[PDB]
Amino acid sequence: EAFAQNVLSKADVIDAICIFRELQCLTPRGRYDIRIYPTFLHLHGKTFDYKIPYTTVLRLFLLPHKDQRQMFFVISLDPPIKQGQTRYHFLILLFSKDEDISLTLNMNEEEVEKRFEGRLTKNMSGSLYEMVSRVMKALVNRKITVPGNFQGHSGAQCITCSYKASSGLLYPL
DNA sequence: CTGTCTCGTGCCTGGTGTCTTGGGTGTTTTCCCCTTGGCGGGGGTCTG
């Protein structure tokens, strides 16, 4: 804080709409902060960084976990973000239902009303996954797909099955 | 009084996950190759 104050005392600072710090990502793997912009999102990592325009997004999927304790937030990309010799077709995020948050936008009330048409507010609070879903919806306009009318025998909304030498969850959307 | 189990941080390190690479192996992709696509004079032969 002292260094920041010393910097501000000499600089003339004039941005991101909202910044989520450290969100459990599964594809790619690791903790990544997410900065929101009017036309894209900056996925900042401890080493690698990516920038996904909203024009590249195709679908947003919000799925529950088999144990009913976690939430999967999937973003379908196009073109896929590239990293050396690998291309990711989906951005997967993992959240916990008991992981709340309180966010405040970097905009004013009237500007938010004009931009998001009242879909968002200057200050919000609620579950982390709910907040991310609401923000991404208000940004992309695409509706977030949710599980259908399927309910497995174990009461879960998916089936545990293998695929390409790897276990995982299959959701009938 | 009292101290042992528990919650809640710091700290760090070592253990998880996955790019990246190499080998095995089936499959397309071109080029090459093989199969294919007017007039007359006679003669004899058959039928009645």
Swiss-Prot record:
Covalent cross-link site, Glycyl lysine isopeptide (Lys-Gly) (interchain with G-Cter in SUMO2): K114
Subcellular location per the Swiss-Prot or TrEMBL entry: Nucleus; Nucleus, Nucleolus; Chromosome
Modified residues (N6-acetyllysine): K51
Residues making up the signal peptide according to the UniProt record: none
Modification after translation (UniProt): Phosphorylated by CK2 following UV but not gamma irradiation. Phosphorylation inhibits its DNA-binding activity. Ubiquitinated. Polyubiquitinated following caspase cleavage resulting in degradation of the N-terminal ubiquitinated part of the cleaved protein.
Family the entry assigns: Belongs to the SSRP1 family.
Domain notes: The HMG box DNA-binding domain mediates DNA-binding. It has both affinity and specificity for DNA damaged globally with cisplatin.
Known function: Component of the FACT complex, a general chromatin factor that acts to reorganize nucleosomes. The FACT complex is involved in multiple processes that require DNA as a template such as mRNA elongation, DNA replication and DNA repair. During transcription elongation the FACT complex acts as a histone chaperone that both destabilizes and restores nucleosomal structure.
Miscellaneous comment as given in the Swiss-Prot or TrEMBL entry: Autoantibodies against SSRP1 are present in sera from patients with systemic lupus erythematosus, but not other rheumatic diseases.
Subunit and partners: Interacts with MYOG (via C-terminal region). Component of the FACT complex, a stable heterodimer of SSRP1 and SUPT16H. Also a component of a CK2-SPT16-SSRP1 complex which forms following UV irradiation, composed of SSRP1, SUPT16H, CSNK2A1, CSNK2A2 and CSNK2B. Binds to histone H3-H4 tetramers, but not to intact nucleosomes. Identified in a centromere complex containing histones H2A, H2B and H4, and at least CENPA, CENPB, CENPC, CENPT, CENPN, HJURP, SUPT16H, SSRP1 and RSF1. Interacts with isoform gamma of TP63. Interacts with FYTTD1/UIF. Interacts with SRF. Interacts with NEK9.
Name of the protein described by the UniProt record: FACT complex subunit SSRP1
Organism: Homo sapiens (Human)
Encoding gene, per UniProt annotation: SSRP1
